Write a protein that binds this ligand. Structure first.
Ligand SMILES: *[C@@H]1O[C@H](CO)[C@@H](O[C@@H]2O[C@H](CO)[C@@H](O[C@@H]3O[C@H](CO[C@H]4O[C@H](CO)[C@@H](O)[C@H](O)[C@@H]4O)[C@@H](O)[C@H](O[C@H]4O[C@H](CO)[C@@H](O)[C@H](O)[C@@H]4O)[C@@H]3O)[C@H](O)[C@H]2NC(C)=O)[C@H](O)[C@H]1NC(C)=O
Length: 318
């Protein structure tokens, strides 16, 4: 099915994600700060350009990645390979980690905090820590199939007694109507991630949750892009990220569409920025350069595809 155009204001776009989806949220937020012009959210991700000049495992497992060059590159690329970093001073940025995350980790997120500290006033950056939470998406309900917030295992979505989706949306957008406490009003559309909407490393189908208010075209909506993490693509866990992460109940009472782009497991070995070659068996978003030297720059194929999806959705603005 073709990705529809909706009555969404192009000035109301943001993105967030977990894991490699968190990394990608920041890559989009930085490289395309003009497109994601409200802000972005990072759950258990890491520094922009973290893995370009140091090996990816140094950007994981609660290690201490360097941000010297990554920060320098942001300064250097501003206005060319990425949108003006001045934009970032005018963005709401949400950050979250579990204190017991040993997959990415507080130390990694601390480095992202420091990096962004060079481009956005602390007042606009919220960095929340849930004590005891492991690498997992934090929600405050028992989604079907959820793993314990104390055990990092598939589907990496938990009841951590913390509404992470709500927190991120409220930090990015400000005051929101109370989340829907009943059945959702909308549907979960599928669309073809093909042509300009698709790319290497991406599934051929994406999804989006569309509240009844946004479907009719009679109401101007906003757009939030939510990016699953590694081992969280549709191929791995089906619709569990779409359904169990808690974005939809907020979208539903706040005239918001939630777009859910899908990556896919990729067992082909590719040259990456640093450390030689690597396949992408876990279906992560590209934060290491699997599909291009420009993965976190304007033109990066996955970012270009997601931005394409965004432009299509907002093309229906009335
Ligand atoms: C990211 O975080 C930063 C830091 O908190 C935010 O930036 C501040 O934003 C507020 C509100 O927009 C600014 O407040 C305005 O300050 C003006 C004076 O600015 C002078 O001084 C600052 C340094 O203190 C210089 O940077 C600036 O160039 C000026 O020299 C006031 O004149 C404003 O008041 C007038 O406008 C308001 C609104 O219309 C009216 O209500 C008033 O009556 C009056 O007419 C206002 O108080 C503040 O200056 C900003 N500080 C910074 C960092 O420069 C970002 O907004 C935030 N990102 C976002 C947008 O979310």
């Amino acid at each position: 099915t073709a990705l529809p155009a909706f009555n969404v204001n192009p000035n109301s776009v943001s993105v967030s994600g977990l894991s490699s989806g968190g990394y990608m949220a920041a890559q989009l937020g930085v490289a395309y700060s003009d497109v994601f012009n409200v802000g972005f959210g990072v759950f258990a991700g890491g520094p922009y350009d973290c893995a370009r000049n140091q090996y990816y495992t140094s950007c994981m497992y609660n290690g201490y990645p360097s941000i010297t060059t990554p920060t320098a590159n942001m300064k250097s690329w501003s206005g060319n390979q990425i949108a003006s970093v001045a934009n970032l001073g005018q963005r709401k940025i949400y950050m979250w980690t579990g204190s017991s995350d040993t997959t990415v980790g507080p130390n990694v997120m601390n480095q992202l905090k420091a990096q962004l500290g060079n481009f956005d006033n602390s007042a606009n950056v919220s960095y929340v820590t849930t004590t005891g939470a492991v690498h997992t998406f934090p929600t405050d309900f028992n989604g079907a199939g959820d793993n314990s917030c104390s055990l990092s295992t598939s589907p990496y979505i938990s009841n951590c007694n913390y509404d992470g989706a709500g927190a991120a949306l409220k930090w990015i957008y400000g005051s929101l109507n109370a989340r829907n406490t009943g059945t959702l009003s909308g549907s979960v559309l599928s669309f073809a991630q093909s042509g300009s909407y698709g790319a290497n490393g991406m599934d051929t189908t994406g999804y989006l949750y569309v509240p009844q208010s946004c479907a009719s075209g009679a109401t101007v909506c906003s757009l939030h892009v939510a990016l699953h993490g590694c081992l969280q693509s549709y191929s791995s866990i089906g619709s569990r990220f779409i359904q169990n992460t808690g974005y939809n109940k907020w979208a539903d009472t706040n005239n918001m569409i939630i777009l859910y782009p899908q990556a896919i497991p990729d067992y082909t070995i590719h040259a990456i920025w640093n450390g030689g070659v690597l396949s992408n068996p876990n279906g992560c978003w590209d934060w290491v350069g699997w599909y291009g030297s420009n993965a976190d720059q304007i033109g990066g194929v996955q970012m270009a595809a997601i931005v394409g999806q965004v432009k299509q959705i907002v093309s229906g603005f009335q």
